[PDB]
């Protein structure tokens, strides 16, 4: 594992520097390598609402040496600290994404194009009910690759303690 | 022989005997400490073995049965008999503080007091409800009420010929002083007169003795013993005091 430190008290909150500084550049590095890696929030703290934390940790099973993180994160030094050591340890929790359904309009189209004709209130119950529980979890914005949309992902503990990965570096089914 | 303080918070006595001959209102304090000896008598009837040594009274709320007239003097109300002898009644939201010493003081004996006190009456008055029974550690653990201390120094250092005259002069100087009933003075030597409550106890004709007491606030009171009442029995002068 390699620990990337958010430098505190530098201005902005840790979550925006998580959202637009480390995650975007990591996404490209993770997808271009065919061996997938993983993202862990050691300081993840679910008090009332999520608070990602002050640390991110990049995890795997030599491929991290092929990630070349010294030179892909040299533009945000006055913001992100790159610990050069790559140690291995077992005190890790891996992280999965929780789907937030979709805006009523999005679902309405989907459920009208190939679904039933009459469909009202029950979507306004189902979407809203699941979302509130989902929206309180920790959120990361990510700029799109081929759709041009602002996806607010929602991260949550899994405890799976070993597993496969996605291109964002999280657990998948 | 650990000593602990047990607070009985917001005890709502309904129809306690307010009438105590020359004193109507605050009942005799012998009632309020005979509640303690009854609550210890029935606890040692069980396997609790608690000896209550002192009880402090905090008078949080009060109501006298009766109506206020046009002038201001109350008129007391009484039940209709099934000839009405002089009698009057009071409801008291008051809280007890029990100094308890014995085998051990714990939350299970608070539950035992919780079970036992719901078959008891205080000054002849039924208990509607109770808020909480908790062991306290300091004066802070006591809610806002007004304790009844024995201000015997005001009665003793009062101008007059007789001590009644002194009490009339004392109530005409400070207003928070209330004349309260404390104990019983012997009128005859003890013996086995016939017609008793329990034939084996020695029996003595008595007369209520009275004194002057004051009301002290909760976070203004200094110390806890300073507000705790105790039983003392000199020869022919049974009475409850503050020492």
């Amino acid at each position: 594992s390699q620990i990337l430190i958010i430098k505190p008290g530098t201005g902005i909150s840790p979550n925006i520097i998580i959202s637009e500084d480390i995650f975007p550049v990591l996404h490209s590095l993770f997808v271009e390598h065919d061996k997938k890696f993983g993202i862990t929030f050691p300081a993840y703290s679910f008090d009332k609402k999520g608070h990602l934390g002050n640390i991110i940790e990049v995890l795997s099973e030599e491929a991290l040496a092929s990630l070349c993180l010294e030179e892909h994160l040299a533009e945000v030094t006055d913001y992100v600290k790159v610990k050069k050591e790559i140690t291995f340890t077992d005190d890790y929790v891996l992280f999965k994404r929780i789907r937030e359904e979709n805006q009523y309009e999005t679902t309405a189209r989907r459920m009208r194009k190939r679904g039933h004709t009459e469909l009202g209130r029950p979507l306004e119950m189902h979407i809203k009910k699941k979302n509130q529980q989902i929206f309180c979890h920790a959120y990361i914005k990510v700029k799109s690759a081929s759709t041009g949309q602002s996806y607010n992902i929602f991260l949550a503990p899994t405890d799976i303690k070993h597993g496969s990965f996605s291109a964002y570096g999280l657990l998948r089914g | 022989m650990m000593k602990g303080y047990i607070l009985l918070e917001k005890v709502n006595i309904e129809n306690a005997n307010a009438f105590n001959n020359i004193i109507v209102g605050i009942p005799a304090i012998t009632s309020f400490l005979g509640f303690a000896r009854a609550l210890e008598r029935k606890l040692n009837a069980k396997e609790i073995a608690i000896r209550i040594n002192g009880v402090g009274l905090e008078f949080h709320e009060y109501e006298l049965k009766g109506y206020k007239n046009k002038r201001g003097q109350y008129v007391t109300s009484c039940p209709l008999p099934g000839h009405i002898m002089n009698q009057a009644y009071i409801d008291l939201n008051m809280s007890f503080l029990l100094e308890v010493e014995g085998p051990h003081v714990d939350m299970s004996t608070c539950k035992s007091i919780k079970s036992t006190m719901e078959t008891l009456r205080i000054a002849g008055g039924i208990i509607r409800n109770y808020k909480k029974i908790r062991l306290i550690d300091t004066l802070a653990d006591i809610p806002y009420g007004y304790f009844l201390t024995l201000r015997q120094d005001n009665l003793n250092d009062a101008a007059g010929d007789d001590m009644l005259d002194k009490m009339i002069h004392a109530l005409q100087q400070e207003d928070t002083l209330v004349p309260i009933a404390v104990g019983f003075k012997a009128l005859s030597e003890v013996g086995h007169v016939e017609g008793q409550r329990d034939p084996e106890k020695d029996h003595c004709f008595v007369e209520s003795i009275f004194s002057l007491g004051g009301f002290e606030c909760s976070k203004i009171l200094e110390d806890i013993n300073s507000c705790l009442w105790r039983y003392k029995t000199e020869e022919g002068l049974y009475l409850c005091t503050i020492i």
């Binding site: 609402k49 119950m125 809203k128 009910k129 529980q133 989902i134 929206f135 309180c136 | 806002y144």
Partner: protein
């Protein structure tokens, strides 16, 4: 299930508290205590086994505005929606 999922009925939820809260202020010394047995029994109202994730309780009639810690009084608000109604009860009763 016991949870204020719909936001349309929300304005009634502020208005009932404001109607039984107007001129009903009560200092903390005379307010009901927040016993944990009430939220325990309201969790045992329908399943749950704990307070559900992202929903958290609210006395429809503000405690300060003479509320009880009963079962028939409390509710689950959303966190952003709880922020809306707690700004409402902060502004209306002037705490």
């Amino acid at each position: 299930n016991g949870c204020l999922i719909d936001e349309a009925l929300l304005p009634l939820i502020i208005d009932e508290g404001k109607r039984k809260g107007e001129g009903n202020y009560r200092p903390r010394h005379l307010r009901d205590e927040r016993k944990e047995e009430t939220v325990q029994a309201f969790l045992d109202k329908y399943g749950y086994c704990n307070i559900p994730v992202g929903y958290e309780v609210h006395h429809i009639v503000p405690l300060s505005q003479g509320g009880a810690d009963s079962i028939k009084n409390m509710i689950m608000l959303s966190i952003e929606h709880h922020e809306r109604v707690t700004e409402a009860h902060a502004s209306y009763f002037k705490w």
